[PDB]
Design a binder for these strands. Sequence first.
RNA 1: UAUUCCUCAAUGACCGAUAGCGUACAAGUACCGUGAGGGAAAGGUGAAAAGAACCCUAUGACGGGAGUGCAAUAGAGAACCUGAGAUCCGAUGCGAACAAUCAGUCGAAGGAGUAGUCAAGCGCACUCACUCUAACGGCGUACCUUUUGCAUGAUGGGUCAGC
Lengths: 51, 44, 155, 110, 49, 64, 118
Amino acid sequence: LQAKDKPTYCPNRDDGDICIVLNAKDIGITGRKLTDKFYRWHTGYVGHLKE
Amino acid sequence: PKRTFQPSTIRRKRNHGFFARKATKGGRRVIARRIAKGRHRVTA
Amino acid sequence: KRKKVQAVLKAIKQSPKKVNLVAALVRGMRVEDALMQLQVTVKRASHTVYRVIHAARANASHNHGLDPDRLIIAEAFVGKGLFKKRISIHGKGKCGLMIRPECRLTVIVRETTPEEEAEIARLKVHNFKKLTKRERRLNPHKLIETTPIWNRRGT
Amino acid sequence: MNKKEIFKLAKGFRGRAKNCIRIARERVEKALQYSYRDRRNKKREMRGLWIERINAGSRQHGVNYGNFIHGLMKENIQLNRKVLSELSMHEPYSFKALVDVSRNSFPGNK
Amino acid sequence: AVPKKKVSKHKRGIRNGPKALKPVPVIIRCRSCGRVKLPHFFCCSGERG
Amino acid sequence: KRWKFKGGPASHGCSKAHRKGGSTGQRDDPGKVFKGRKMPGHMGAAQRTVKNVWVYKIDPARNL
Amino acid sequence: ALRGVWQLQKLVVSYCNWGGSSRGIRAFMESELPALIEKNPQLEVVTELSRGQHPYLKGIYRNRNERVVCVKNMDPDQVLLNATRLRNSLGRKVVKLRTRHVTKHPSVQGTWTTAVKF
RNA sequence: UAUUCCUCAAUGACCGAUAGCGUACAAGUACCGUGAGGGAAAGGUGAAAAGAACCCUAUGACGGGAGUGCAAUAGAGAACCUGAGAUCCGAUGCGAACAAUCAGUCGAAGGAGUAGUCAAGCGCACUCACUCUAACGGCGUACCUUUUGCAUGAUGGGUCAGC
Ligand SMILES: [K+]
Ligand SMILES: [K+]
Ligand SMILES: [K+]
Ligand SMILES: [Mg+2]
Ligand SMILES: [Mg+2]
Ligand SMILES: [Mg+2]
Ligand SMILES: [Mg+2]
Ligand SMILES: [Mg+2]
Ligand SMILES: [Mg+2]
Ligand SMILES: [Mg+2]
Ligand SMILES: [Mg+2]
Ligand SMILES: [Mg+2]
Ligand SMILES: [Mg+2]
Ligand SMILES: [Mg+2]
Ligand SMILES: [Mg+2]
Ligand SMILES: [Mg+2]
Ligand SMILES: [Mg+2]
Ligand SMILES: [Mg+2]
Ligand SMILES: [Mg+2]
Ligand SMILES: [Mg+2]
Ligand SMILES: [Mg+2]
Ligand SMILES: [Mg+2]
Ligand SMILES: [Mg+2]
Ligand SMILES: [Mg+2]
Ligand SMILES: [Mg+2]
Ligand SMILES: [Mg+2]
Ligand SMILES: [Mg+2]
Ligand SMILES: [Mg+2]
Ligand SMILES: [Mg+2]
Ligand SMILES: [Mg+2]
Ligand SMILES: [Mg+2]
Ligand SMILES: [Mg+2]
Ligand SMILES: [Mg+2]
Ligand SMILES: [Zn+2]
């Protein structure tokens, strides 16, 4: 996506290719990350950190 | 409130007048100092 | 021959901000449309800007041979003048500094180009389009002429 | 430094930093310090750009930069990184020839 | 409370932006007396008043 | 009126803070006013729903 | 000289025969000016007198450019060095060099694109 | 031999309108104080007033023409030679309402305006042409003083001109 595999790479331009990812529900996850990895975010109100 | 300057012409002439300054030795030096400086109003 | 004709009024006893607030309304307007808008704008500076625009049209007509029906307001700007310094007295023995202001007004007019006349004719046809500020100042209002009629049989 | 010479260098500065001598003298000196530092930082920035382009050109044929540059060192080919990157961008077949020569020289592990 | 810093020209102009005047959409002039007026303003009554 | 606050006393020395809200935060940690703080503003004229309200009678001739 | 065409055309030497700041440029004319004229046949050397002013060397080029170097209070070696600098220059404006390799065809085999096959 | 309330003549590597006496100008004035006392500010049209007859628009010319004059922004009523800066209002070109920070520096797509050279066939490609703007990327916590040590939430400074 960064177009870092093209020999005409320039950092200040956007010339990456288009990535089409198939079968996203069959991605592999190792270990116990299904029940031990969390996504957390704060909604701006005090005491409202969500996981 | 009652301010400090309460005017009275006879009191002014009796304290800072020409013949009140001319009466004592300090006032005569005041008159000499005023004339030497060049004041228009030598006395009050 | 002469492209631009100006008229300057000095020593107006008002604020430059207050005068410029009305002077910025009429920039880029036609003269006979600005004169009509200044007669329905309720401000103190409206009479002054009316006088200066009137004098500019008169100068262009009389001295330099320009056509009064085809004048447009190229520029209209405000400069400072001789400010008068007085003292304002507050409570508790303090003071500030008060200013009585004075300004000058300059109005510059020119003849409308034939291309701009074609623009005005294109703008006066009916369309639903959003107008930019230049086109809106070129076509500012709808002028309606009415006659008084006594005993128009109704209410 | 002169006042007018600072007012020439503060040309194009936003705000009161192009009119007032007290404000313009501070911002001009910071600009001169940035220019002095960036005369040294430009060299590192450009060399990193060359390495990125050489690596991108070389990995197309399956050879890493680290193997490719050491193969050209082993074959006593003394083209520097700037010229190599320009070759990768503008002469793809000569760069492919250089990649093949370097692969025959130093294949590395893996 | 006092202002902590000086208000720059950029911020002063942004503040005074929306307060500028706007033109009037409809203007009427009487054909007889020639007065320029807004709608719903009375100037003249016709003849035989 | 909006949030049924108590306000301040009507006597005993209180000066010009009879119906004001009082404090609006703690000092310096956090150093800011929290979101959702109860403050004066426009009241009512919003949409509300009343649940479990009982139908007593029906007049189909007049649709009442 | 741009593609064989010499760009400096006129070299004006303005001096003064009375003032003390023109001693170096005066002594430059007897010593180094004939050698410069003899070794530069294509160049035109003009001599001007301006009493009571400071001396200078003015170079006038083909692209309608004038470059003036004031040579007050200088030595003949410095005056000759600045005359040589005037001769060796194309008369272009003194700005930063953007590129040190000027080309109009950057590629012979064609610039790499996405649709390049090997 | 000492001094200058005084007079006459002369000199200055003394000053030149924030300087020189407090006072280049009706100053120990105006103004402040009960009083003793304190104590300012403010120079210049043009060679000569020839200081703008007359016309137009406004209540009113200080405006726009006309005329005098070398010159009129050289057009003033204790002020008009030159006319800098902070500051205010406009015009032209580019950026600018989905993107944050001592506001720059190093690269830079694009947009806009404008030049010249001459061999060859009066085109066209050459001058990295030149000037203004800068989407986007990397990097970047003001200055002075005082300190073992300050982006410091330690001091000082609203800005400009003169001293
Ligand atoms: K003049
Ligand atoms: K940047
Ligand atoms: K403190
Ligand atoms: Mg009051
Ligand atoms: Mg009082
Ligand atoms: Mg103030
Ligand atoms: Mg004020
Ligand atoms: Mg209670
Ligand atoms: Mg109560
Ligand atoms: Mg109370
Ligand atoms: Mg109280
Ligand atoms: Mg003085
Ligand atoms: Mg002066
Ligand atoms: Mg003065
Ligand atoms: Mg008195
Ligand atoms: Mg007059
Ligand atoms: Mg003169
Ligand atoms: Mg300015
Ligand atoms: Mg603009
Ligand atoms: Mg955008
Ligand atoms: Mg921001
Ligand atoms: Mg740059
Ligand atoms: Mg460009
Ligand atoms: Mg172009
Ligand atoms: Mg950063
Ligand atoms: Mg300490
Ligand atoms: Mg120390
Ligand atoms: Mg630090
Ligand atoms: Mg601080
Ligand atoms: Mg701070
Ligand atoms: Mg201290
Ligand atoms: Mg402070
Ligand atoms: Mg200063
Ligand atoms: Zn009417």
